[PDB]
């Protein structure tokens, strides 16, 4: 089972908004290389290879994990779409 | 009220059978001991079989040999049963070599005689040759461990030659006995018996002192708790070709490359001794 | 797709009688049907598998 | 091609009894008698 | 809370486990009760072979 | 073996080729006399390097060999080689087939004075180096630059000269003294195959 999930469950009326959040939350940190991200580096998620501990490249556990943090704010008409990503844009460049 | 070191007896016939007792052990230790050997000498014994067999014009497992009675696949199945004996520790490999023909049913004996190898089931039929029949092969017998199938090591000593399931472990079977045991005062002490069925090539003390020796080397690993290659140095291009090329590829071969023979390599000179010895100041 | 092949179950210089096996078919041993193979069976459950 | 036995390969035997292969052990963990014959084939009481 | 859901003085079998499983998916959640559920199983087997 | 001493010849050219040679240590070259009495470098024979190659396909050598430096080497006979050794040869004289194309490229390439800083360069990294307090240096004559650089010693004097004046190089008692790599790498532009 995923962790948390009963918790994020929780944060929502509808499991199937959690999964929008995870979602969308998943494709802003891929198009903006996860520079984006709301944790801390010991906080990030870690992946096993043959040479040692490297970064999760599965970005729906970091959305997931970000959730569960608390830090990140969901919702509808927060803001308009283009002002966001352009915000996004420049706050994080490509 | 502490046990002593327990008496133990041999008891041999020939190199195929053996039984090893030893008692009195305490109450358990029959299966705590006599349980983990027969897991080793089932699994870990090292031993030899037939990895290769080529066949005088024969292509593959599935032909057919005029004069033969016996298929090819059924031939490397007789094959398979062959017990071969190195006496020579050192000797990883042998092949033999075997020719026959004429109304003669062929055996092991039949096999070219090879130093420090002896055949111990020298009554093992192979093929049944009539009037006209050739067999002429080279078998290939390799020393290893455990079982390793014929898609595995994929072994071939020329092109025609077929691969064979490699059944390495001489041990044949392992079974053990605890019994009950008395040392005067203390009672339901434990006897342990055991009994090991090999090939021949092995003998049972030996196949035991081996799985012994293995659990005890396996033992050890409980005792602690918790040189780079050139081409990666990122040295000149030059001295990557040269010096990869020239048989090193590491600074631990740098090292070992003394004045006349670092010096002495034709694409080194003076360009070459500047970026190593800057390499060696940038590491030390 | 698979192997039809006949082996031989005599050796030469044989006596046989009229209606004697000469050569096994596939699937057969020694003139007996053999769709199979003889193991020795336990009848028991084994960690789930 | 020569085809070994192996994992999913299906089995079974005239009384109606079938199933696939799941698990090929080595011979150290077989069950065996106690003169040290190892079994060959394990089948599950629960299905009959 | 696990002392509360099982029924020890009675041998467990399809219906008790299933309650069980129920129980424990109303008090503990998802994860804990799948953690329940391969611990069942592994030890359900463990014993399931050597019960002879 | 062998030891032969500086402008000595291991063999003639038009002399019987009933010998192999592989050479141990030193650095040997291969040269032609031309009709107007020029000498010319046809390649660089190497430690390790295999040559005398005509023993091989003729019955006399084609060109002349002479050691640039005291070179010890080995003879040996081409009809006792067995696998491995005709293996070597194959590997060495493919070797030596790169190593004299990207010469013969070298000879075509730039100027005189870029052609002279890239046998510099090249010279650098032979037997037939060394190195000092003053820094790295070659023991070469400009009448064998000259022979290595397709030109005559006078305009190698001259071109040496001009760099002496630039302070790139220093030169006395057949002795030259590359005081500054970077720009006779600058000048050379392209490395010459030194392996």
Same mark, same amino acid.
Request: proline letters at 5%.
């Given at each position: 089972?995923?962790?948390?999930?009963?918790?994020?469950?929780?944060?929502?009326?509808?499991?199937?908004?959690?999964?929008?959040?995870?979602?969308?939350?998943?494709?802003?940190?891929?198009?903006?290389?996860?520079?984006?991200?709301?944790?801390?580096?010991?906080?990030?998620?870690?992946?096993?290879?043959?040479?040692?501990?490297?970064?999760?490249?599965?970005?729906?556990?970091?959305?997931?994990?970000?959730?569960?943090?608390?830090?990140?704010?969901?919702?509808?008409?927060?803001?308009?779409?283009?002002?966001?990503?352009?915000?996004?844009?420049?706050?994080?460049?490509? | 009220?502490?046990?002593?070191?327990? &008496?133990?007896?041999?008891?041999?016939?020939?190199?195929?059978?053996?039984?090893?007792?030893?008692?009195?052990?305490? +109450?358990?230790?029959?299966?705590?001991?006599?349980?983990?050997?027969?897991?080793?000498?089932?699994?870990?014994?090292?031993?030899? *079989?037939?990895?290769?067999?080529?066949?005088?014009?024969?292509?593959?497992?599935?032909?057919?040999?005029?004069?033969?009675?016996?298929?090819?696949?059924?031939?490397?199945?007789?094959?398979?049963?062959? &017990?071969?004996?190195?006496?020579?520790?050192?000797?990883?490999?042998?092949?033999?070599?075997?020719?026959?023909?004429?109304?003669? #049913?062929?055996?092991?004996?039949?096999?070219?005689?090879?130093?420090?190898?002896?055949?111990? =089931?020298?009554?093992?039929?192979?093929?049944?040759?009539?009037?006209?029949?050739?067999? =002429?092969?080279? &078998?290939?017998?390799?020393?290893?461990?455990?079982?390793?199938?014929?898609?595995?090591?994929?072994?071939?000593?020329?092109?025609?030659?077929?691969?064979?399931?490699?059944?390495?472990?001489?041990?044949?079977?392992?079974?053990?006995?605890? #019994?009950?045991?008395?040392?005067?005062?203390?009672?339901?002490?434990?006897?342990?018996?055991?009994?090991?069925?090999?090939?021949?090539? &092995?003998?049972?003390?030996? *196949?035991? =002192?081996?799985?012994?020796?293995?659990?005890?080397?396996?033992?050890?690993?409980?005792? =602690?708790?918790?040189?780079?290659?050139?081409?990666?140095?990122?040295?000149?291009?030059?001295?990557?070709?040269?010096?990869? #090329?020239?048989?090193?590829?590491?600074? +631990?071969?740098?090292?070992?490359?003394?004045?006349?023979?670092?010096?002495?390599?034709?694409?080194?000179?003076?360009?070459?001794? #500047?970026?190593?010895?800057?390499?060696?100041?940038?590491?030390? | 797709?698979?192997?039809?092949?006949?082996? !031989?179950?005599?050796?030469?210089?044989?006596?046989?009688?009229?209606?004697?096996?000469?050569?096994?078919? !596939?699937?057969?041993?020694?003139?007996?049907?053999?769709?199979?193979?003889?193991?020795?069976?336990?009848?028991? !459950?084994?960690?789930?598998? | 091609?020569?085809?070994?036995?192996?994992? /999913?390969?299906?089995?079974?035997?005239?009384?109606?009894?079938?199933?696939?292969?799941?698990?090929?052990?080595?011979?150290?963990?077989?069950?065996?008698?106690?003169?040290?014959?190892?079994?060959?084939?394990?089948?599950?009481?629960? /299905?009959? | 809370? @696990?002392?509360?859901?099982?029924?020890?003085?009675?041998?467990?079998?399809?219906? %008790?486990?299933?309650?069980?499983?129920?129980? @424990?998916?109303?008090?503990?959640?998802?994860?804990?009760? @799948?953690?329940?559920?391969?611990?069942?199983?592994?030890?359900?087997?463990?014993? %399931?072979?050597? %019960?002879? | 073996?062998?030891?032969?001493?500086?402008?000595?010849?291991?063999?003639?050219?038009?002399?019987?080729?009933?010998?192999?040679?592989?050479?141990?240590?030193?650095?040997?070259?291969?040269?032609?006399?031309?009709?107007?009495?020029?000498?010319?470098?046809?390649?660089?024979?190497?430690?390790?390097?295999?040559?005398?190659?005509? $023993?091989?396909?003729?019955? $006399?050598?084609?060109?002349?060999?002479?050691?640039?430096?005291?070179?010890?080497?080995?003879?040996?006979?081409?009809?006792?080689?067995?696998?491995?050794?005709?293996?070597?040869?194959?590997?060495?004289?493919?070797?030596?087939?790169?190593?004299?194309?990207?010469?013969?490229?070298?000879?075509?390439?730039?100027?005189?004075?870029?052609?002279?800083?890239?046998?510099?360069?090249?010279?650098?990294?032979?037997?037939?180096?060394?190195?000092?307090?003053?820094?790295?240096?070659?023991?070469?004559?400009?009448?064998?630059?000259?022979?290595?650089?397709?030109?005559?010693?006078?305009?190698?004097?001259?071109?040496? $000269?001009?760099?002496?004046?630039?302070?790139?190089?220093?030169?006395?008692?057949?002795?030259?003294?590359?005081?500054?790599?970077?720009?006779?790498?600058?000048? $050379?532009?392209?490395?010459?195959?030194?392996?």
């Amino acid at each position: 089972a995923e962790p948390g999930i009963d918790k994020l469950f929780g944060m929502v009326d509808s499991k199937y908004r959690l999964t929008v959040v995870v979602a969308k939350r998943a494709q802003q940190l891929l198009r903006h290389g996860f520079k984006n991200t709301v944790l801390e580096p010991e906080e990030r998620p870690k992946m096993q290879t043959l040479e040692g501990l490297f970064d999760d490249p599965n970005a729906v556990t970091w959305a997931m994990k970000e959730l569960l943090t608390g830090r990140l704010v969901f919702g509808e008409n927060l803001v308009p779409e283009d002002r966001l990503q352009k915000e996004m844009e420049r706050l994080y460049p490509v | 009220s502490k046990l002593k070191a327990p &008496v133990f007896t041999v008891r041999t016939q020939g190199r195929e059978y053996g039984e090893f007792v030893l008692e009195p052990l305490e +109450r358990g230790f029959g299966v705590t001991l006599g349980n983990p050997l027969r897991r080793i000498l089932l699994s870990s014994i090292p031993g030899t *079989a037939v990895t290769s067999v080529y066949i005088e014009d024969v292509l593959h497992e599935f032909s057919t040999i005029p004069g033969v009675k016996e298929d090819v696949v059924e031939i490397i199945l007789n094959l398979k049963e062959l &017990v071969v004996r190195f006496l020579n520790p050192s000797l990883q490999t042998v092949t033999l070599l075997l020719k026959a023909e004429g109304p003669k #049913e062929v055996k092991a004996r039949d096999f070219l005689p090879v130093a420090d190898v002896e055949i111990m =089931n020298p009554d093992l039929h192979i093929a049944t040759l009539e009037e006209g029949g050739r067999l =002429n092969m080279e &078998v290939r017998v390799d020393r290893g461990v455990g079982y390793v199938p014929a898609e595995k090591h994929g072994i071939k000593d020329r092109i025609n030659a077929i691969p064979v399931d490699a059944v390495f472990s001489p041990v044949r079977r392992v079974a053990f006995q605890v #019994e009950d045991t008395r040392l005067g005062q203390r009672t339901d002490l434990d006897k342990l018996t055991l009994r090991i069925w090999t090939d021949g090539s &092995v003998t049972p003390l030996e *196949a035991l =002192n081996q799985a012994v020796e293995i659990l005890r080397e396996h033992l050890t690993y409980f005792s =602690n708790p918790q040189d780079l290659p050139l081409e990666e140095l990122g040295l000149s291009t030059r001295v990557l070709h040269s010096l990869k #090329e020239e048989g090193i590829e590491s600074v +631990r071969a740098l090292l070992a490359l003394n004045l006349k023979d670092l010096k002495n390599i034709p694409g080194i000179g003076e360009r070459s001794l #500047e970026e190593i010895k800057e390499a060696l100041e940038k590491k030390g | 797709g698979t192997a039809l092949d006949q082996r !031989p179950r005599v050796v030469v210089g044989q006596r046989v009688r009229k209606g004697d096996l000469l050569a096994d078919g !596939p699937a057969s041993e020694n003139g007996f049907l053999a769709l199979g193979q003889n193991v020795l069976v336990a009848i028991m !459950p084994f960690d789930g598998y | 091609q020569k085809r070994k036995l192996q994992v /999913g390969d299906k089995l079974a035997n005239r009384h109606g009894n079938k199933g696939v292969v799941a698990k090929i052990l080595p011979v150290e963990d077989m069950p065996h008698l106690p003169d040290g014959t190892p079994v060959d084939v394990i089948l599950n009481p629960l /299905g009959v | 809370v @696990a002392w509360e859901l099982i029924q020890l003085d009675v041998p467990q079998e399809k219906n %008790s486990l299933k309650d069980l499983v129920y129980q @424990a998916f109303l008090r503990l959640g998802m994860e804990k009760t @799948a953690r329940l559920l391969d611990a069942l199983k592994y030890y359900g087997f463990t014993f %399931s072979t050597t %019960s002879g | 073996m062998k030891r032969f001493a500086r402008k000595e010849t291991i063999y003639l050219r038009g002399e019987e080729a009933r010998t192999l040679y592989r050479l141990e240590e030193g650095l040997v070259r291969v040269v032609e006399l031309l009709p107007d009495g020029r000498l010319i470098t046809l390649r660089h024979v190497l430690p390790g390097d295999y040559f005398g190659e005509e $023993a091989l396909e003729g019955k $006399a050598y084609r060109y002349t060999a002479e050691a640039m430096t005291e070179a010890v080497v080995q003879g040996l006979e081409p009809r006792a080689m067995d696998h491995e050794a005709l293996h070597r040869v194959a590997r060495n004289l493919a070797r030596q087939m790169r190593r004299v194309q990207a010469y013969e490229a070298h000879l075509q390439t730039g100027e005189l004075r870029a052609r002279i800083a890239r046998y510099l360069l090249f010279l650098a990294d032979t037997p037939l180096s060394a190195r000092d307090r003053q820094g790295i240096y070659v023991t070469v004559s400009h009448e064998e630059i000259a022979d290595a650089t397709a030109s005559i010693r006078e305009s190698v004097s001259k071109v040496l $000269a001009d760099l002496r004046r630039e302070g790139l190089i220093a030169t006395a008692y057949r002795r030259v003294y590359l005081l500054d790599l970077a720009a006779l790498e600058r000048e $050379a532009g392209s490395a010459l195959e030194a392996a």
